[PDB]
Structure formats: structure tokens, C-alpha cells
């Protein structure tokens, strides 16, 4: 190619979007923004496929051009805006607030949150280093730069950001024993506590996580997001509570529900 | 002794003509020979720290960084200026016959003057930036045949 791609073929769209195969030749190509294209949930999908507010592309445009949707406290009119993990989606007309979390099957789920709980997001620190003028600055995986961060904050940390004031109100150090959520790979959406961190020089670092029921899983450092200090996450979790179920137990639940 | 070229050969960003020379300072400071640990658990040879050679492609005293693959092998040829051929021997599985066949790969690697090598030695090379048309590796450890 002689430049950037503008189109996303529907077959080549992320599989967690759960787009259907015959809905068209194309999928919404996510715009550049805070989250990666392959790891985000675009606004058009949230509005039409998930919340059912809109029925068409044009209806999503109509809703967004009314300035009805705020992402993390700010009005977005781009339909392909890449909304991502832990983002607050608020509609200050119906009075509903949503935190974009992962279910245990790797798919973004709009989790309803309280009005007070929609006043902060959780960000993962990507790096800490000196900017111009020798001023220390923090950057996250959701594209934010924060200057003069707390010196106790290091890379891979989780900071609590107040959307109203745009400051770090609290932070969590990436340590063994902190409850985490996996945001990438086959364990996406799984919640557990870190048991040990296995480091290997020159290559990716492996984190060993054990969930509440005792199942153990391992994932790379880049796919781990701390959500609480200790065994108590700072945000509310979806109904699964991050506890992945085997297909046999899912069938048990379905059989019990049908029997009732 | 090392000035064998039509140009003076100096370590970049080391001021040799400094007036306030000192030996207790870190490498590259106060006219001290610059050297670095390559990382990845590889010791810096003492002949690189105490050497007088100037090699910009040296992993320990030059400007190259070791990043990427770490490959073991045997010195197959050492007839070039600071460059040797590393032969890697491996078994290629043939699916249909469920057997293996012997296959080899000739990997050119730059060798710094801190190592002296002969054909047949066991060497450890690390991936670096392209140093020439065919060279993307630097010798990091040399184990003699005996």
C-alpha cells in the first residue's frame, strides 16, 4: 500500500465485537485515539449493536451529533472513537453511566456504575521519565500524559484518575497479592490475585494469577491490570466476578435455569 | 598502536584531551576508556575494559546494543577482519517419514578484539543492528574447543 488503510473488512474485525458474517462487507474501522484499534469497542458498536439506542449507521450519527454521549466526561461526536477498557461512558440525558470492562469470555461489557463511581477511571502507568525542562511526567496505556506524578509511582502501576479534576487521587503499586484483571489473551476478563512474578532478562515477563475459587493461570505483564489493593478491587465487577467457568459448569447453569 | 588507519580512531563522546583527568570516575568520563555491560547475564571481558583497541561495533566498548536473538554455534571461519562465520547445526524434522535430517546455517557475526577465536570454538552471539551487508550479530562469549 501507499499509505494508511481507511477501511476495515468485516471478516478482519476484532472477534470480541461479535459482528455477524453477513451484515456487510465492512466493519467500523476505529479512529485513532486513547486505545488500540484491536483492543477497543467503537462508539457506534456501543450505541447500535449493544445498547440498541440506534438501529443504523446514520442513526448513530444522529445520536452522537446531538452531543448526547460523553466518554470519560467529554463529549465525543466521532462514531469510531476507540472506547476502551475502564472507560466511563455516560449519557447525561437518561442518567446512565457505563464502565467498559471485560467479561470472562474476552468481550467488552457495558457495566452500569453509580454516579459517584463514574467520577473516576483506573489507568495503567506505561512509563515514568523526565520530559522537557527536566519535569517528571507519567504516561498511561490509554494515552494520557500526567506531569508531576507522585515519585512513588512507577511503570506498570495503576492510578486512580478523577475525571472532574484530572488528577491522580490514588494509586496502586504493582505488587504480589494485588487483585488484577487480565485485559489480553485467552484469560481476558479473568480476575485474581498475583501470586508471583517470574522475570526473564531480555524477554516478556510472566505473571502468575490465582482467582478466588483457586484456579491458577499465567499471562504476560502487558496483559495484567491492577484493580485493587489486596483482595478488594477498587471498581465493581460484572456478574461473573471475573471467575471463568468451564463449559461443563456453564451447561450446569443452563440446565438449572431451564429446570427452574 | 591501535592507530592503524588513515584516521585517528577514538571512542565517541570521550574527551581524551581533558585537563582534569581522573581514574575514579565512571567509564567515558575524565578521559577514561568507555565500556558497558551488554546485559543478559554476560560478563564484560577484562581485555575490553583494559584494551587499547577502538571498535565501534564492539558490544562492550562500542556503540552497538545487543537486542533480539541469542544464538549459540561453532566458529566455522575466522579469515575476515573482525568478522567470523558462525555455523549453527540443527535437526530438521521431516513430517512424512517421522525422521530428522541434519541442517546447518552460516551466520556472520562481528567479533571484537577482546576475543581471539579459532575455527571450531563454541561461540555465543547476540543480535545487534545491521553492521554490514550480511552481519547482524556480535560475539558475546567464546569457549575454546579444548
Amino acid at each position: 500500500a501507499r499509505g494508511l488503510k481507511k477501511h476495515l473488512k468485516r471478516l478482519n474485525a476484532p472477534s470480541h465485537w461479535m459482528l455477524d458474517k453477513l451484515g456487510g462487507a465492512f466493519a467500523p474501522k476505529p479512529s485513532s485515539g486513547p486505545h488500540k484499534a484491536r483492543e477497543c469497542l467503537p462508539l457506534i458498536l456501543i450505541l447500535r449493536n449493544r445498547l440498541k439506542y440506534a438501529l443504523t449507521y446514520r442513526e448513530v450519527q444522529s445520536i452522537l451529533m446531538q452531543r448526547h454521549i460523553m466518554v470519560d466526561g467529554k463529549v465525543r461526536t466521532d462514531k469510531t472513537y476507540p472506547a476502551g477498557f475502564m472507560d466511563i461512558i455516560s449519557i447525561p440525558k437518561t442518567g446512565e453511566n457505563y464502565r467498559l470492562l471485560y467479561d470472562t469470555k474476552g468481550r467488552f461489557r457495558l457495566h452500569s456504575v453509580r454516579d459517584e463511581d463514574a467520577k473516576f477511571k483506573l489507568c495503567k502507568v506505561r512509563s515514568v521519565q523526565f520530559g522537557q525542562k527536566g519535569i517528571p511526567y507519567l504516561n498511561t496505556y490509554d494515552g494520557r500524559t500526567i506531569r508531576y506524578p507522585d515519585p512513588l509511582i512507577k511503570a506498570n502501576d495503576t492510578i486512580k484518575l478523577d475525571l472532574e479534576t484530572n488528577k491522580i487521587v490514588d494509586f496502586i503499586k504493582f505488587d504480589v497479592g494485588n487483585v488484577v484483571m487480565v485485559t489480553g489473551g485467552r484469560n481476558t476478563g479473568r480476575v485474581g490475585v498475583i501470586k508471583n512474578r517470574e522475570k526473564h532478562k531480555g524477554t516478556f515477563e510472566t505473571i502468575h494469577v490465582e482467582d478466588a475459587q483457586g484456579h491458577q493461570f499465567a499471562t504476560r505483564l502487558g496483559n495484567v491490570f491492577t484493580i485493587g489493593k489486596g483482595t478488594k478491587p477498587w471498581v465493581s465487577l460484572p456478574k461473573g466476578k471475573g471467575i471463568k467457568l468451564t463449559i461443563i459448569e456453564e451447561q450446569r447453569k443452563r440446565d438449572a435455569a431451564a429446570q427452574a | 598502536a591501535e592507530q592503524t588507519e588513515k584516521s585517528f580512531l577514538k571512542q565517541p563522546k570521550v574527551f581524551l584531551s581533558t585537563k582534569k583527568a581522573d581514574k575514579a570516575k565512571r567509564p567515558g568520563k575524565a578521559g577514561n576508556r568507555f565500556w558497558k555491560s551488554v546485559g543478559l547475564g554476560f560478563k564484560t571481558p577484562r581485555e575490553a575494559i583494559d584494551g587499547t583497541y577502538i571498535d565501534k561495533k564492539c558490544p562492550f566498548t562500542g556503540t552497538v546494543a545487543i537486542r533480539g536473538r541469542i544464538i549459540a554455534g561453532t566458529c566455522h571461519s575466522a579469515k575476515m577482519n573482525r568478522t567470523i562465520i558462525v555455523r549453527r547445526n540443527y535437526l530438521h524434522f521431516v513430517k512424512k517419514y517421522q525422521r530428522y535430517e541434519k541442517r546447518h546455517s552460516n551466520i556472520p557475526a562481528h567479533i571484537s578484539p577482546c576475543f581471539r577465536v579459532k575455527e571450531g570454538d563454541h561461540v555465543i552471539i547476540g543480535q545487534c543492528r545491521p553492521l554490514s551487508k550480511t552481519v547482524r550479530f556480535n560475539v558475546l562469549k567464546v569457549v575454546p574447543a579444548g
Partner: protein, 230 residues
């Protein structure tokens, strides 16, 4: 050879057809921007002096200034330049077109001429009238220069001087007045003030964060010294 004569002072244009060989010779071998004396090219043109501004050949190809010949050449031309308008063509696109040299020769269909000095007689349809300017000044400083105002003089009053008044096809009166550009209004002053205040707040925020960070670091160091005092 036709002559397309223009009088820039009165804004009148008229095509003159000269076929006699002598009068045509008094223009041959001359170049664009070179001036001719009207007495040479006729009787009615005494006193007048004409500037050669270009022309076209028998195939409609324009003359170009600086080519320095009488014949036709092919040149790689840029868009928006003379001899290549390039309408609808992409930016940065060049084209090789046929242009004629700047020298006037016998192979020219028309010479574009301009009157620079008015003769003793009057040319019919050329210097016997005056077509007025279609539009007046639109930028405020140009208006002030036109009507010789100075500082603290209002320009709007003079915009109403050259309003174009006409009747609509229905029959109602319509007046057209230009919008003044580069005119100082209270909104412009407010915009400049808001820019200055934005700089103010930038500086204040910078100093506030720097001071808070310094205080936090000082408190951290004092806490470390308290630990050391163990």
C-alpha cells in the same frame, strides 16, 4: 494582424485590425513589455504610446516572456503561470505546452497592446468614455486611504458612499454594501484579551504545579530524614 488595444486608465477595450505591411513592421522584431510609438503604426495614433503585453499566433498559442525567439517552443510549465492555467489539474502538476517566443513576428494573429500615454486626439470607444470601478475597497485601511481619513476616524460612514443601488425584478429597492475586513470591533478586543488571559492562566497553572511538586518533594525528604533519625 489584429491589435487588441486596452486603455487601463478608462478601462475600455477595443480590437484594431492593421493589415498594411509598414505599420505591422513598426511592431515586428519587438518584445513583450517593449513600448511602441503610435505615430509609427498609423495616422489616428499620433502621440499615443503602446506597450506590447503579449499575443497569440495563427494557431492560438500564447507568447511567453523570456523565451527570446520568434518561433514556437515546448516548455514544462507550472500551474497558475502564464501560458498554463491548469484548471482542474492536481497540485504540483506540470505540463509541456507549446508557447511562442516573446519576440513579435509575422506569424502572430493578435497583439495585446496597452495605452500608457494618452495622445493628442481621442480614440473612439477607447478614450472617449470611462467605465467605472465595479467594486470599492473592502479592507478598512484601504477605505481610509481612499477617503483620506486618519486615526480615530470611522470608516463605515464612507462605506455608505459607494453603495450599489438597484431595483429587484419585482421592483423593490435593494442596496449592496461590502462587509468591512480588518475592522476593529469590541469582539476583536475581547478576543485579544482572552488570548492574553489564556497566557496568564497557563503561567499561573505552571507555577502552581511546580510549587506543589516542590513542596511534596520537600516533605518526602523531611520524612526520609525522620527515618534516618532512627
Amino acid at each position: 494582424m489584429k491589435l487588441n488595444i486596452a486603455n487601463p486608465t478608462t478601462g475600455c477595450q477595443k480590437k484594431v485590425e492593421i493589415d498594411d505591411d509598414q505599420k505591422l513592421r513598426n511592431l515586428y522584431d519587438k518584445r513583450i513589455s517593449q513600448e511602441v510609438v503610435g505615430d509609427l503604426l498609423g495616422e489616428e495614433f499620433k502621440g499615443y504610446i503602446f506597450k506590447i503585453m503579449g499575443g497569440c499566433d495563427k494557431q492560438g498559442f500564447p507568447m511567453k516572456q523570456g523565451v527570446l525567439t520568434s518561433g514556437r517552443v515546448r516548455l514544462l510549465l507550472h500551474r497558475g503561470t502564464p501560458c498554463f492555467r491548469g484548471f482542474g489539474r492536481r497540485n504540483g502538476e506540470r505540463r509541456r505546452k507549446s508557447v511562442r517566443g516573446c519576440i513579435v513576428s509575422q506569424d502572430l494573429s493578435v497583439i495585446n497592446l496597452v495605452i500608457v500615454k494618452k495622445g493628442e486626439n481621442d480614440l473612439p470607444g477607447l478614450t472617449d468614455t470611462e467605465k467605472p470601478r465595479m467594486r470599492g475597497p473592502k479592507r478598512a485601511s484601504k477605505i481610509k486611504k481612499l477617503f483620506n481619513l486618519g486615526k480615530d476616524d470611522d470608516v463605515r460612514s464612507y462605506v455608505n458612499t459607494y453603495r450599489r443601488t438597484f431595483l429587484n425584478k419585482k421592483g423593490k429597492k435593494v442596496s449592496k454594501a461590502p462587509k468591512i475586513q480588518r475592522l476593529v470591533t469590541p469582539l476583536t478586543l475581547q478576543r485579544k484579551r482572552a488570548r492574553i488571559a489564556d497566557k496568564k492562566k497557563r503561567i499561573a497553572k505552571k507555577k502552581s504545579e511546580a510549587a506543589e511538586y516542590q513542596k511534596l518533594l520537600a516533605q518526602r525528604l523531611k520524612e526520609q530524614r525522620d527515618r534516618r533519625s532512627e
